[PDB]
Amino acid sequence: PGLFLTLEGLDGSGKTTQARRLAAFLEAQGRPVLLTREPGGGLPEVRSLLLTQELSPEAEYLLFSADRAEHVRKVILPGLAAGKVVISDRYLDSSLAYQGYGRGLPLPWLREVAREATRGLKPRLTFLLDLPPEAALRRVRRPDRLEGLGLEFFRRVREGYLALARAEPGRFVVLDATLPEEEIARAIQAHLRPLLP
């Protein structure tokens, strides 16, 4: 039986680091793992196409969705059927936070599109590394994709993630990303222990 886990948060939150550490932990326990990420896990060329000038938010979401559709069908679902713990650094939630709450695309449309794109595949758990957007922005420069975009954009993203976590409190594990790195890794692993076992 596979297990689908995701990690989410602003760039700089630590989700990338924690995704890697979790993979390495499970590998040390003899468990097969697939460590992946969006965007690019399905169609790597979408990472390039996402640097098109003045790209509409709609087309941006649809390109992310095409990538995610391949990601689910070619990478994630086969890994799960193979019994792996498939860990994605970003999944659907990132599109809802960034393109929904961030860019203002209507959420019902985002979800109508995602319904087939994902085949309804949802993570068993999702680790949200939460922290203030001012704090995120100081840790690391933004993706080339997200320049111009100001503090208020990132606030809407941060709050959107938190609204997603409120609606799906069983799925979302919200962690304070200003805790020490070891403490976040400890908490992630504590959440996973009864599942892996």
Known binding residues: 9-16
User: From the CB of 1, what's the least distance to a copy of itself, in Å?
Assistant: 24
Task: Single out the segment in contact with a copy of itself by CB under 8 A; choices: 44-52, 130-138, 147-155, 187-195.
Answer: 44-52
Q: Which does 55 bind (CB under 5 to 8 A by kind): a copy of itself, Mg ion, Cl ion, none?
A: a copy of itself
Measure the CA dihedral 116/125/77/47, to 10°: 70
33-37/85-89 β-pairing: parallel
| Strand-pair partners of 156 | none
194 binding Cl ion? (CB under 5 A): no
Give the DSSP letter of residue 178. T
Are 83 and 134 a contacting pair, CB within 8 Å?
A: no
91 binding Mg ion? (CB under 5 A): yes
Give the DSSP letter of residue 165. H
Show contacts with Mg ion in window 25-64 (CB under 5 A): none
21 binding Mg ion? (CB under 5 A): yes
CB atoms inside a 10 Å sphere around CB 27:
13
3-state secondary structure (DSSP) of residue 126: strand
3-state secondary structure (DSSP) of residue 103: coil
Among 40, 62, 122, 187, binds a copy of itself (CB under 8 A): 62
20 binding Mg ion? (CB under 5 A): no
Give 21's contacts (C-beta < 8 A, 6+ positions apart): 185
Residues that bind a copy of itself (CB under 8 A): 42-43, 45-46, 48-49, 52, 54-56, 58-60, 62-63, 65-67, 69-70, 73-74, 105-106, 109, 112-113, 115-117
Residues that bind Mg ion (CB under 5 A): 6, 8, 14, 16-18, 21-22, 65, 68, 82-83, 91, 93, 114, 117, 126, 130, 158, 161, 168, 171, 185, 187-188
